[PDB]
């Protein structure tokens, strides 16, 4: 790698560590249990959900979901985490050299279509075959408990776990993920992009740094880059399917209210 190409790697990685509260290194330490014997409170049933909620009481009441169905209460808590991640993602994007310079319209489009791809890409870091971290690493909701919920709420996460399990097998660290996320954000393939040409160029540089980083970070996984290239397509479809389900949930659920910020994201997607 060259100087110019290096500063890009370093600048993106720092933005990642700075803007995202949870990251794979902290997550693996919690899911491993090698640095502490105080594991996350496990949420595996309604009983344990209600208990965990006693701590989230202030929040739930604040948004008036205290008495909503357990699925809707969960659906909503998941939205808040999404709204929070979109906020960090926006700051992270503004940190990628060349992003802030883009027409404000293209900035919106990029975040609009990339946010969820990045979200599920990053959510894998806190997922394993039995469940996933919640509430900043303090809780652990089981994969089984999620499939126990009633339809359609139980058809939301299972597909993500399936993806995460294959993605997690790639053994990427936070240095790989930062570049990977920046790439999914600066995608010249988005619908309605004004300056596809320039953005495509920006995407090339980032993609270039990614390719070279992967080679010197994972010398034994020769085709890891193209593998990640496939993962990018998989995430695209994954999110498309996710948008579909959320659409079904909206037109068929009285209390499935959608947070505004998220609302504008799904609109026309």
């Amino acid at each position: 790698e060259t100087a110019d190409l290096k500063s890009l790697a370093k600048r993106i990685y720092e933005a990642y560590l700075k803007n995202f509260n949870m990251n794979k290194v902290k997550a693996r330490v919690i899911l491993s249990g090698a640095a502490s014997n105080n594991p996350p409170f496990v949420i595996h049933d309604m009983e344990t959900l209600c208990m965990a909620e006693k701590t989230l009481v202030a929040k739930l009441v604040a948004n008036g979901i205290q008495n909503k169905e357990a699925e809707v209460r969960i659906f909503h808590c998941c939205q808040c985490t999404s709204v929070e991640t979109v906020t960090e993602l926006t700051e992270f994007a503004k940190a990628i050299p060349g992003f802030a310079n883009l027409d404000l319209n293209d900035q919106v489009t990029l975040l609009k279509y990339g946010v969820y791809e990045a979200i599920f890409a990053m959510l894998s870091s806190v997922m394993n075959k039995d469940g996933m971290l919640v509430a900043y690493g303090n809780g652990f909701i089981t994969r089984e408990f999620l499939k126990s919920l009633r339809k359609p709420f139980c058809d939301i996460m299972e597909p993500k776990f399936d993806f995460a399990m294959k993605f997690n097998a790639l053994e990427l660290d936070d240095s790989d993920i930062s570049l990977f996320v920046a790439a999914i954000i600066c995608c010249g393939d988005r619908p309605g992009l004004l300056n596809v040409g320039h953005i495509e160029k920006m995407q090339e540089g980032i993609v270039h740094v990614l390719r070279l980083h992967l080679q010197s970070n994972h010398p034994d996984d020769i085709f890891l880059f193209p593998k990640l290239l496939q993962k990018m397509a998989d995430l695209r479809q994954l999110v498309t399917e996710h948008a579909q389900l959320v659409q079904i949930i909206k037109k068929t659920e009285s209390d499935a209210a959608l947070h505004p910020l998220l609302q504008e994201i799904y609109r026309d997607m």
């Binding site: 926006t90 919106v108 609009k112």
Partner: peptide, 15 residues
Amino acid sequence: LTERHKILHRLLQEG
């Protein structure tokens, strides 16, 4: 116009 993304837009501007 694509500014039917007011909240997101504001995040892009202020923070």
